[PDB]
């Protein structure tokens, strides 16, 4: 799964 | 003085977050379609997945 | 300019919201992935097809 | 479809 890019 | 930098920076962040959000949602929609095709199966694992989609 | 400041604050709210939505949909995907991993042994090929979508 | 559709970008701004 492509992890959400951290803010 | 006052800076317009913030607006343009935030706008980029908004478009990048929108992309990621639409990317994950699309997969969910794809999965929903696969489950809808296998409704007659009465598969307990699929049922669990279906509940997560609609939680 | 107050218009610009309002626009900034509005964008900030928007960023928080999109982040929430993004994590909300991703969370579902993650939980789905875990469920598929638990059932790797069983011959239920639809789960592999769900897995292929997750990694697409 | 019973999925929660993503809120549109026209909205929230």
Swiss-Prot record, chain A:
Q: Where in the cell is it found?
A: Nucleus; Cytoplasm, Cytoskeleton
Q: Which domain of life is it from?
A: Eukaryota
Q: Anything further noted? A: Present with 656 molecules/cell in log phase SD medium.
Q: What does it do?
A: Involved in karyogamy. Component of a cortical adaptor complex that orients cytoplasmic microtubules. It may be involved in anchoring cytoplasmic microtubules to the cell cortex.
Protein name as it appears in the record: Karyogamy protein KAR9
Write down the species.
Saccharomyces cerevisiae (strain ATCC 204508 / S288c) (Baker's yeast)
Residues of the whole record sequence present = 621 to 627 of 644
UniProtKB/Swiss-Prot annotation, chain C:
Q: How is it modified after translation?
A: Acetylation at Lys-28 by KAT2B/PCAF promotes dynamic kinetochore-microtubule interactions in early mitosis. Crotonylated by KAT5 during mitosis, promoting astral microtubule plasticity and dynamic connection between astral microtubules and the cortex during mitotic chromosome segregation, thereby ensuring accurate spindle positioning in mitosis. Decrotonylated by HDAC3.
Please list the residues that carry the modification N6-acetyllysine.
Answer: 28
Q: Where does the record place the region Interaction with SKA1?
A: 40-56
Q: How would you summarize where this protein is expressed among tissues?
A: Ubiquitously expressed.
Q: Where is this region: Interaction with APC?
A: 14-19
Region feature (DCTN1-binding): 16-56
Annotated transmembrane regions? none
Region feature Interaction with CDK5RAP2, mapped onto this chain: 1-56
Region spans: APC-binding? 28-50
Q: Where is the EB1 C-terminal domain?
A: 1-56
Specify the signal sequence span.
none
Localization recorded for this chain is: Cytoplasm, Cytoskeleton; Cytoplasm, Cytoskeleton, Microtubule organizing center, Centrosome; Golgi apparatus; Cytoplasm, Cytoskeleton, Spindle
Q: What does this protein do?
A: Plus-end tracking protein (+TIP) that binds to the plus-end of microtubules and regulates the dynamics of the microtubule cytoskeleton. Recruits other +TIP proteins to microtubules by binding to a conserved Ser-X-Leu-Pro (SXLP) motif in their polypeptide chains. Promotes cytoplasmic microtubule nucleation and elongation. Involved in mitotic spindle positioning by stabilizing microtubules and promoting dynamic connection between astral microtubules and the cortex during mitotic chromosome segregation.
Its domain description in UniProt is: Composed of two functionally independent domains. The N-terminal domain forms a hydrophobic cleft involved in microtubule binding and the C-terminal is involved in the formation of mutually exclusive complexes with APC and DCTN1.
What is stated as this protein's family in its record? Belongs to the MAPRE family.
Q: Tell me how this protein assembles.
A: Homodimer. Heterodimer with MAPRE3. Interacts with DCTN1, DCTN2, TERF1 and dynein intermediate chain. Interaction with DIAPH1 and DIAPH2. Interacts (via C-terminal residues 206-211) with APC (via C-terminal residues 2674-2843); the interaction inhibits association with and bundling of F-actin. Interacts with CLASP2, DST, KIF2C and STIM1; probably required for their targeting to the growing microtubule plus ends. Interacts with MTUS2; interaction is direct and probably targets MTUS2 to microtubules.
Designated name of the protein: Microtubule-associated protein RP/EB family member 1
Supply the source organism's classification.
Answer: Eukaryota, Metazoa, Chordata, Craniata, Vertebrata
Q: Which gene encodes it?
A: MAPRE1
């Amino acid at each position: 799964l492509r992890p959400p890019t951290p803010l | 003085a006052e800076l317009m930098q913030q607006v343009n920076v935030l706008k980029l962040t908004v478009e990048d977050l929108e992309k990621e959000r639409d990317f994950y949602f699309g997969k969910l929609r794809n999965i929903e379609l696969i489950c809808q095709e296998n409704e007659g199966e009465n598969d307990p694992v699929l049922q669990r997945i279906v509940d997560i989609l609609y939680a």
